[PDB]
């Protein structure tokens, strides 16, 4: 339906033949889905195409046409030289392309953790159905409420709220939320802003609740049209890698041409320059990495996958780089540090008042879940709530001032919350108390859940509800006695500090007594005792207005005037609630200290209790002075800007803050260059999660909050954040592990060849051999390092700085130190076969350099064979050393600094596998006879393998010297 806005609700409903009260039949849904397709943009549909991608590189094509002009000149080992090079490079492509496509798929599949959802009413179920937006069809009834992301193009049928505010910004630009209505917008031309009866796919619900019919899905929606005409930013680390990418690439390209020029008049020996060119371009293919290395994205994909399987769904990828550098975590308390498993465990009422004297009737409630299964005790001895007249009224207030209920889940077997956590915990208390002595012992678990509550409800009619407001911090309900004349009453619950002041009397049993200063102070005595004690209880004071104003003397829709209607109150009692810190939080807090990350708790608790919980969880010490390190939103607002900013530098605890305080806190933190992870879940936290470095949204939270954040905690657990920061740090190490191994080995390949040229020695490795090691190393041990376990002490050092360079000075030295020795160890093995080996030696003086003058200049200073220089045995020492030293160097990259005696070779059980699998392929080109002709003949079974190993192995020892320097320096 294309003109839905201009036409009536009735016209739209009629067009799709859908019942507003019912929604589409499973059949309609089916046919409509056929007709209109899934509510999504199409997936733009690699393999063979991705292989030929690699041959588009000009340096790879230069080599192939230098191996063809070498073949065609020969035709009119070197017979099938272009045959092998092509076969290796098509395999070298697939090795590093299939690795890339796999990594990208695994990163793409992260989206399955957070699928786009929607809420439809359908014919098959009476209740609202929460299906994937993907499956939403033009025609069906949708429900949207505060915090929702509008799933498709919707014509509003009815606004169930008093007002519906929509955040259209994503589509129109109007950053102020638009008001909405049901009436038809008669102009068929009218632009989106004028379409005030329409909900646009991709937009948010800033407040209220609407019911509507889907007009257009897929590419037919307004934002779907945009995303077809829609046709960009590099993370700090990418810029420092690409920069180093050129740095490395342009050094090797200079040495590559310098190898061609060092061989001056050597073009004559057997026009002749084409050999020294293809041996200098094969280095340009082997030592220069064009396009981001495949193992980099492989270990990022694997990292984020681990994170999701830990409940940390990464929404924004670059936030994995930001995650290493985080220095501050702003966690909310009630959902995230504490379980939100709430239960009233203590309560008091007034006992005896005599002038300045005031005593209390304290009670404790056993049973800490939501089940109506426990005892009310007084002095550790069980008592019957019903005997105390105050407890009756306390229980009446808790029953009526309640928008929740309980629900016995039959299949799970346990009693379950319906309303809010705080209120269910009040329902549960009214159940345990049973102030009216109702027969409940014969009730079924299901019928039991609300029995005692529903008795009180049959005692007075709930007329209306004065809803909670942050200013007064309390809510109330107006009530008239059911049937039959005790006058109407109001029941108030809220913060103790707030409501106790609004009390003019106190209830003692069924007696009313004038509220004095000694009684007021006595009440708060225990209130403080409880919130500061072993269990940091969240107290509520429960009060009644005995004489409420006339039902028509109160404005029932204006929030601000409510507190006025909640005065002349009578204090009745207090319920102390328990909501315990999550067990891992204690230790995750400790980790953050060691990590060097500051943790700031934001709470709804009053300051005193707020501080106490911080002491409990370890944010503070049990004795620690805190006066200038914890603030309420009110206190914080009375500090001058500069002191506010200063306060943010040291504060670990913020109690009772405005929604606008989180953005302020982030901002101030930022002026000190802190990298801050903020938690949020409401429409209100959206701007603040945008401002923070790592916006962390709650899974249970609103779509809006998630859409505006980098990461969503699936399990709302604070520890999930700490785990995520570790997985962030663990990733960055695993990058530099593979980065060291790739960069040092390529420096090895450059040092290997530039020694052969700049000294004068015979060819160390042929182009067919160089491209072989460069395929086996990049194919097995390199791709195995993407699987080595998270490094050892990652969480014990301070957080990485975002201004730091990718590769430091010291690290560039380790890349050279190793890169040098590996290059020298291969050229010092082929040269060893002549000089000091027992298979036809060159002169230990220094004659091997001048191999050029032998075939013609034999009679001068030689006296030996002049064809055993191209021998098939020095080159099989240079290859065998290179492979083995690369397998040896791969063990150096299981940790950046930690020695092999603390992190053994079997830490990565898979790298050891790729060593054996690389050794099987290396031994196959030495023994299986069709091949070693095109390569070279085997190394002497036992004597020369001991030399290869005593040449290669010291590279492990060399790094251990560098690692000992490294570990014993920090």
């Amino acid at each position: 339906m294309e003109a839905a806005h201009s036409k009536s609700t009735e016209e739209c409903l009629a067009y799709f033949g859908v019942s507003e009260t019912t929604g589409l039949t499973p059949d309609q849904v089916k046919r409509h889905l056929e007709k209109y397709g899934h509510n999504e943009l199409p997936a733009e549909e690699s393999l063979w195409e991705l292989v030929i991608e690699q041959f588009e590189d000009l340096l790879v094509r230069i080599l192939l046409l230098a191996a063809c002009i070498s073949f065609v000149l020969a035709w009119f080992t070197a017979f099938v030289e272009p045959f092998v090079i092509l076969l290796i490079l098509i395999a070298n492509a697939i090795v590093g392309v299939w690795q890339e496509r796999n990594a990208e798929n695994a990163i793409e599949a992260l989206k399955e953790y957070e699928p786009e959802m929607g809420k439809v009413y359908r014919a098959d179920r009476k209740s609202v159905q929460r299906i994937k937006a993907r499956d939403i069809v033009p025609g069906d009834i949708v429900e949207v409420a505060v915090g929702d992301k509008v799933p498709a193009d919707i014509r509003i049928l009815s606004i169930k709220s008093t007002t519906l505010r929509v955040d259209q910004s994503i589509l129109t630009g109007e950053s102020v939320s638009v008001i909405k209505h049901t009436e038809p917008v008669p102009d068929p031309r009218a632009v989106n802003q004028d379409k005030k009866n329409m909900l646009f796919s991709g937009t948010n619900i800033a407040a209220g609740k609407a019911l509507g019919i889907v007009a257009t899905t897929g590419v037919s929606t307004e934002i779907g049209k945009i995303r077809d005409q829609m046709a960009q930013d590099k993370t700090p680390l990418q810029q420092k890698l690409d920069e180093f990418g050129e740095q490395l690439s342009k050094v090797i390209s200079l040495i590559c041409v310098a190898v061609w020029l060092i061989n001056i008049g050597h073009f004559n020996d057997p026009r002749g320059a084409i050999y020294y060119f293809k041996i200098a371009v094969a280095l340009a293919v082997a030592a220069i990495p064009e396009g981001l290395p495949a193992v980099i994205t492989t270990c990022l994909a694997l990292g984020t996958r681990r994170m999701a399987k830990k409940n940390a769904i990464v929404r924004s990828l670059p936030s994995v780089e930001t995650l290493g550098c985080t220095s501050v975590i702003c966690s909310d308390k009630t959902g995230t540090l504490t379980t939100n498993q709430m239960s009233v465990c203590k309560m008091f009422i007034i006992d005896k008042v005599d002038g300045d004297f005031c005593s209390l009737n304290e009670f404790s409630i056993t049973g800490s879940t939501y089940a109506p299964e426990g005892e009310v005790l007084k002095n550790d001895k069980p008592i019957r709530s019903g005997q105390f007249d105050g407890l009756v009224e306390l229980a009446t207030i808790c029953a009526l001032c309640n928008d929740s209920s309980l629900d016995f889940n039959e299949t799970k077997g346990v009693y379950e919350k319906v309303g809010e956590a705080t209120e269910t915990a009040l329902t549960t208390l009214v159940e345990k108390m049973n102030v009216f002595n109702t027969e409940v012992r014969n009730l079924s678990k299901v019928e039991r859940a609300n029995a005692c509550n529903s008795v009180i409800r049959q005692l007075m009619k709930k007329e209306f509800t004065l809803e909670f407001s942050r200013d007064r911090k309390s809510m109330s309900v107006y009530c008239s006695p059911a049937k039959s004349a005790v006058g109407n009453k109001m029941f108030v619950k809220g913060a103790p500090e707030g409501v106790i002041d609004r009390c003019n009397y106190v209830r003692v049993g069924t007696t009313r007594v004038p509220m004095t200063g000694p009684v007021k102070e006595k009440i708060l005595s225990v209130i403080k005792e409880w919130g500061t004690g072993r269990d940091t209880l969240r107290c509520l004071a429960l009060a009644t207005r005995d004489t409420p104003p006339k039902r028509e003397e109160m404005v029932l829709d204006d929030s601000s005037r409510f507190m006025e209607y909640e005065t002349d109150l009578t204090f009745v009692g207090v319920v102390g609630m328990l909501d315990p810190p999550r067990k891992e939080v204690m230790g995750s807090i400790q980790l953050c200290r060691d990590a060097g990350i500051r943790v700031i708790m934001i709470t709804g608790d009053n300051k005193g209790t707020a501080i106490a919980i911080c002491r409990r969880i370890g944010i503070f010490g049990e004795n620690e002075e805190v006066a200038d390190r914890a603030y309420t939103g009110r206190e914080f607002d009375d500090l001058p800007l500069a002191e506010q900013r200063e306060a943010c530098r040291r504060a670990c605890c913020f109690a009772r803050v405005e929604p606008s305080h989180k953005s302020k806190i982030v901002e101030y933190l930022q002026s000190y260059d802190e990298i801050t992870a903020m938690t949020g879940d409401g429409v209100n936290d959206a701007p603040a999660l945008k401002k923070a470095e790592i916006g962390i949204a709650m899974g249970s939270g609103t779509a809006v909050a998630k859409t505006a954040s980098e990461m969503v905690l699936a399990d709302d657990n604070f520890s999930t954040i700490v785990a995520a920061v570790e997985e962030g740090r663990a990733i960055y190490n695993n990058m530099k592990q593979f980065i060291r191994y790739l960069i040092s080995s390529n420096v090895g390949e450059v040092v290997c060849i530039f020694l052969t040229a700049a000294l004068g020695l015979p060819e160390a490795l042929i182009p067919v051999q160089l491209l072989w090691v460069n395929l086996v190393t990049d194919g097995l041990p390199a791709t195995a390092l993407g699987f080595n376990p998270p490094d050892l002490d990652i969480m014990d050092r301070p957080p990485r700085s975002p201004k730091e360079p990718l590769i430091s000075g010291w690290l560039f030295f380790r890349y050279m130190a190793i890169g040098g020795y590996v290059g020298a160890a291969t050229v010092g093995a082929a040269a060893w076969w002549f000089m000091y080996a027992e298979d036809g030696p060159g002169v230990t003086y220094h004659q091997l350099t001048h191999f050029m003058q032998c075939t013609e200049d034999h009679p001068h200073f030689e006296g030996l064979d002049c064809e055993i220089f191209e021998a098939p045995e020095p080159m099989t020492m240079a290859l065998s050393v290179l492979v083995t030293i690369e397998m040896c160097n791969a063990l150096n990259s299981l940790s950046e600094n930690q020695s092999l005696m603390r992190m053994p070779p079997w830490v990565n059980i898979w790298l050891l596998g790729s060593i054996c699998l690389s050794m099987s392929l290396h031994f196959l080109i030495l023994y299986v006879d069709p091949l070693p002709m095109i390569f070279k003949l085997k190394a002497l079974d036992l004597t020369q393998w001991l030399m290869v190993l005593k040449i290669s192995l010291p590279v492990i020892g060399l790094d251990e010297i560098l690692k000992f320097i490294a570990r014993n320096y920090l």
Binding site: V80, F83, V84, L87, I88, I90, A91, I94, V95, W98, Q99, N102, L302, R305, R306, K309, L775, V776, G779, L780, T783, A784, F787, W910, G913, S914, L917, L921, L924, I925, V928, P930, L931, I934
Partner: peptide
């Protein structure tokens, strides 16, 4: 049996591809 499973599937495919690469140089023999 999760990351360890996506491990054999990775290495064994990289080994299998190099194995065939040789048995095309080993095949091209006359």
């Amino acid at each position: 049996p999760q990351q360890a499973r996506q491990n054999l599937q990775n290495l064994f495919i990289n080994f299998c591809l190099i194995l065939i690469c040789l048995l095309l140089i080993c095949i091209i023999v006359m």
